[PDB]
Symmetry: C2
Subunit: 331 residues, 2 copies
């Protein structure tokens, strides 16, 4: 008659934006449910397994998790494509895909076999390319590069001879400080500056690899089923709402912090990969997508949905948003 659930999240405690999304979700559920369902959150400082969230929720040890789908590529490579993909969709496009273009259904197709329900957990919007010790001037500079980079982008850089890793949010600055890694990408101005990377890595590259990173709420299938229908709805709605508000917050904080970056950080050197490097990355991505499609029918089905939907909705984005933003004045 009264439910007490626990949520495990990848992030350190009191982590802004990402931790706000899980917090906001839990507060809404309590408030809408007059306390019938309440959700206590354990961050990485507590459960000490930032990348164990999938297992926590699969087993039922936590009813819920907040994390990112593409962290679970080991469990199932198809988990990569429900977060974001290189050269993929923007957040408005991707939210359309999830809720109106078949994405939610495809995600369930992957996650049902684990007894996990996955839901969008909040979008960062467009991400940066990351923080580097040394500039990337040629493809050869990626060879043996120790870079923290998750998801399919990680796969792509491995294909080009890099040495990618997935170090979780709270340990990133330390890994770079000790030279465990020599480059990293995290998110963008909204979180990267308070996390301190610029102190060690002067070069801040523009992105390509995460155009709209969607985080993930995960729910144990049995816990969800243990709920009455009205609370089930409160839960799913609160997650969707928290996810959307996080994109709003990320956009807000990116505005605040790009501004700080263009005035309070004279030693940050904003850079873009040279075109020959982008062409090489683009080709490796396209080739690797083909490989992944050819080797599994479900992978092939997801990538075809992503590609097809992007082609349709991007034409509108180009026609509308992009043209609006590119508009100028002569004279």
């Amino acid at each position: 008659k009264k439910y007490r659930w626990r949520l495990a999240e990848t992030w350190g405690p009191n982590f802004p934006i990402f931790g706000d999304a899980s917090k906001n979700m839990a507060k809404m559920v309590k408030e809408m449910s007059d306390g019938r369902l309440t959700i206590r959150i354990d961050s990485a400082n507590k459960h000490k397994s930032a990348l164990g969230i999938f297992d926590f929720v699969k087993s039922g040890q936590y009813q819920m998790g907040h994390s990112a789908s593409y962290y679970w590529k080991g469990k199932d490579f198809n988990t990569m494509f429900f977060t974001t993909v290189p050269f993929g969709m923007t957040a408005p496009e991707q939210y359309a895909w999830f809720y109106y273009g078949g994405g939610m259904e495809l995600m369930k197709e992957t996650y049902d076999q684990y007894g996990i329900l996955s839901f969008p957990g909040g979008n960062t919007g467009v991400q940066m390319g990351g923080w580097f010790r040394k500039e990337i001037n040629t493809v050869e500079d990626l060879k043996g590069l120790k870079m923290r980079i998750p998801g399919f982008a990680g796969e792509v850089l491995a294909k080009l001879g890099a040495s990618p890793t997935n170090i979780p949010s709270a340990e990133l600055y330390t890994a770079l400080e000790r030279n465990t890694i020599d480059a990293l990408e995290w998110v963008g101005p909204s979180l990267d500056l308070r996390m301190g990377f610029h102190k060690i890595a002067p070069y801040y590259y523009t992105g390509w690899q995460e155009p709209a990173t969607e985080l993930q709420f995960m729910v144990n299938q049995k816990a969800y089923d243990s709920l009455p229908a009205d609370l089930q709805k409160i839960l799913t709605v609160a997650m969707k709402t928290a996810a959307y508000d996080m994109y709003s917050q990320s956009t807000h904080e990116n505005g605040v912090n790009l501004k700080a970056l263009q005035s309070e950080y004279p030693n940050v050197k904003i850079r873009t990969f040279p075109q020959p490097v982008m062409n090489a990355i683009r080709d490796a991505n396209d080739e690797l997508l083909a490989e992944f499609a050819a080797k599994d029918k479900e992978t092939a089905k997801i990538l075809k949905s992503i590609k097809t939907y992007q082609e349709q909705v991007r034409a509108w984005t180009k026609f509308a948003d992009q043209a609006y933003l590119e508009s100028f004045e002569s004279n």
Copy 2:
């Protein structure tokens, strides 16, 4: 105790996207509250007053409404700025403004004095510039032009010599047909084609004047306060959610319908106002913004907040999203 409410909407019945947003909200409230709060929706065919929604809600004749804030230009000029503004913010920028940048609070400053609570009610995304009988090649061509065009955009057109109006959704075609107006804007590919404008006015201009139209839920203050706190939250969350989903839906359907537009409506001729005309519209909007700000301290404050927040958030949009889109193609 059970709460049985009514919502009045501006739109006709089974109106795609806009009407989906109000139904989604009502359905969410019913399901989350296990029937404790249910909301019957009355469309314009039933209450017969498409632009009577403000007064319906103010009076409490209806507990709620779904409409757009800039229709109430005549009851308070400041209501225009909580829908969208010419050369203004995109939807992701504006949601950030509403929820994290002070927009909600500013909107409440305006609506509180009418016993109404106003909330974001769904964004269309970027709108087209409208449907025209004749191409617009010079500023001159706007002079005398009778056009249906709402909100602050109408005021920019009037300043350049056009004659704006605001007719309800339902009689635009007829008004176009009987040469009452010679041009109009409505929304975009998601909703425009089914209205039939293209049969009479084949030139379809790209936009500038409604970069991110946010619809509006209104709630009677007394009605809102009659609710216990958990149903109040269910209600506010439902509106917020329905609003965000409508932007996702609008994006989806804009994509679907743009793809089909060339094939299925070969007589539509896509156009963009000439650069000298845009320069003039731009100057005109800049001028009117100053003029409107000088008339009223609250207006100046609303406009200063939008200007300031947009400057900050657009810098990001250009640095990130636009650069990314231009990086392909």
